[PDB]
Amino acid sequence: ASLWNWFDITKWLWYIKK
Amino acid sequence: EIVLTQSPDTLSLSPGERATLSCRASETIRNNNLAWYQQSPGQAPRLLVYGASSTATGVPGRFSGSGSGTDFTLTISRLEPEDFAVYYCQQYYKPPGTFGQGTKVEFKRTVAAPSVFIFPPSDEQLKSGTASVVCLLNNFYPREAKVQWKVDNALQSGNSQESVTEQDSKDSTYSLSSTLTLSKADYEKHKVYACEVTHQGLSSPVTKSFNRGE
Amino acid sequence: RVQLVQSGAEVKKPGSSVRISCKASGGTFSTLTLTWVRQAPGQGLEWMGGIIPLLSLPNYTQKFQGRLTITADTSTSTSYLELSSLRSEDTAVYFCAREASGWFDKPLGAMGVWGQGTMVVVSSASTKGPSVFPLAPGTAALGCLVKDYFPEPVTVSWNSGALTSGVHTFPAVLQSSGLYSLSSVVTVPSSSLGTQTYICNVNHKPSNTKVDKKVEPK
């Protein structure tokens, strides 16, 4: 899963806040 | 770990020509998390392309990226003089991040054989305990050259260091210097000191040598 | 716009550790990745690791795990790299870089803003002025060998600057001893060796050393 991917965490933080 | 292999190592072109640079990955980059960077001597890298095909804001329009899967391409549609630099691809798909080894875009020119010179160590250095022998290759092209040190016809290994100048902005040639360093005792033991040079412009290897004593 | 300012150059003995800082002027910092990249003299870029400051979450390539620590301070928008057990292979320029931001504010993954770099030299040497040795010579080559100095840089001229055409001053090499060495050469007419004096002028500001060496035929 891209979930555990360190390179995708900032993208998830941006999507979760939006 | 994802390995990125760029090709070619050196691209030799002229201003106004089209440059095509390649980057091949050991593993499919499934979300196209591939970037291209530019670096000039003594400056920090600059982002050119992200997401395999999105040129960064402020980057000139002659830069564009394409490709998917494991094969990616950076195209410079028409080279300007400031575009002659080193380019790196980089993946940010799976940690760790990794760069390619880099591709240099140099100025194109006709093959030129080097002028070869050899310098024995000075007496002032010998009376200090060490001996340095210098082999100079002057104003040649291309940059790739093979310099071999031979002492009494014996191949030397692990006791020399070489340096190369930047491409000359007037005639587009390179110059190289190789330095062989020995102890005074080891230098005084042998007689024949030679540096053998192989280059694309030379029909056969060139050897400059001297006998310790002349 | 956004700029990353890094700390000054460092000289470290082998086995010691180095700490370097990177401060962002403005812009988003806590929710964007901050990565450290190094480049040995003459080689390519090497991705070392990064950090997400809000989560205090680092990620290191396996090569450096155990010697590398990357931290961040959100109040001052500053990141720190620390590399211990230094070896000669660690001599490099170390770059700080911040994730690029996209169409909305979408993190783009690539490194968009770069610091100016911090040079780290790993050497056991102390400050030393160079010894200048002659490289004795219808074209003739001659020069000076500027050997065993530390640290960089050294400036070289010929005949107090009156001789510029045909000069090649090579980039210095760091020898195994931890000292630098370079050569400067010039091509001159062979007929001029008997009547034209050739002097190489060497300056080494770190040791406040000036040297002039006459180069004459054997």
Automatic annotation (TrEMBL), chain A:
Membrane topology field: Single-pass type I membrane protein
Organism: Human immunodeficiency virus type 1 (HIV-1)
Protein name (Swiss-Prot/TrEMBL): Transmembrane protein gp41
Residues in the signal sequence: none
Entry's localization field: Virion membrane; Host cell membrane; Host endosome membrane
Region MPER: start-end pairs: 1-17
Name of the encoding gene: env
Residues of the full protein shown: 671 to 688 of 860
